Amino acid sequence: GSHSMRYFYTAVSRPGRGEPRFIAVGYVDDTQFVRFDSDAASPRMEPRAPWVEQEGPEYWERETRNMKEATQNFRVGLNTLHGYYNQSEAGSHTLQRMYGCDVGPDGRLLRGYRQDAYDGADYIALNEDLRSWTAADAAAQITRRKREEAGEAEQCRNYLEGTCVEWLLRYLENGNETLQRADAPKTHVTHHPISDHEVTLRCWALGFYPEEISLSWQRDGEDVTQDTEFVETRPAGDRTFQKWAAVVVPSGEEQRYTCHVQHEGLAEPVTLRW
Template structure:
């Protein structure tokens, strides 16, 4: 992986310190356009409390989610297949958004590589209830747009991101992300905490 990408991901990880007794499920995704034609490289890492449990790379054979923690091996095949489908869909969505951003920044004729990153997930308190959720994006290493803590509105980082905000407001993206945080993310976090409780829930 590119050293700058590792640095950016590490910076994001260090910012996600959980509150006392809380637990978080975070996904760090990166799409990198290639020189010339070809599908962008898409990589996602899944973390529970900064412990990686899974990884997806569309350059890997089979394009399937790979489990990275011993306790994660207890995940059912049905769940793994569902997450693989989700990540493949995400790869296509990132590809389209990356193309849109190159156009918005007048980079369509630029054959250089560009990078789109996303951090998203949820955090629960000691009683398992939702404390907060997040989704934020960076383009070519700079902040682009972020979902506010109310999970209902967006903060764009520049005038181009304001275009994306208007598009996403029209599409109701904040509501979809909010529903995902309150449903899928919470369910998956509770499931992983149960599977890895001997490691993840130690005091």
């Protein structure tokens, strides 16, 4: 269907304990394929998915170069912004960036994004029209100016429309046997008696991809209220995901309850029972 490639930058200052550490991860869809950590003994961009390993030495030399240059730049960002806000020399401060591009089923650019964040809050983002900036505050507007006068937006649009999309398609191509494929959840129900009067019914979905999923409990064919105990969808470590949903039920009325699961990898919604 539709696909995305995204990069996540993070710079964290550590006053009186070294220079700010810089970390980056690349994703295509729900699949990380790339990483960089400036505290690594030999800071290099590194493969976290099979279909990028094939890339040539020129590629990696290039990516590592950007990462090292990004750590330098973001370190300035931290120092520059720290001044704007006139903050104490006390504790740590953060500068994040997320950028990338979405391509539709046809394979054309749906939209580009390039957001920045200071201390975990929106700071300045490139607008969906890839031409103007949105400043969140007094400081960000100073930054806004600098970028307008320098023509930063145009350069960003170049990469987002062109380079970003090209790479994305290439990766989709080179890693099609896993990127294009959806894995169905393996579902089951567990039975955890609370007391002689109540029991917990927990509905598991395991080993699925991508992470988007829907679990739900019904009684007699109608929804539950109230209510289902979820857990946030969590990685298994093997590139698939996990989720469960539980309900307390009258000890003896287990039959009234069915679990309902919907996921891309299922030809059709599934219905489980105890």
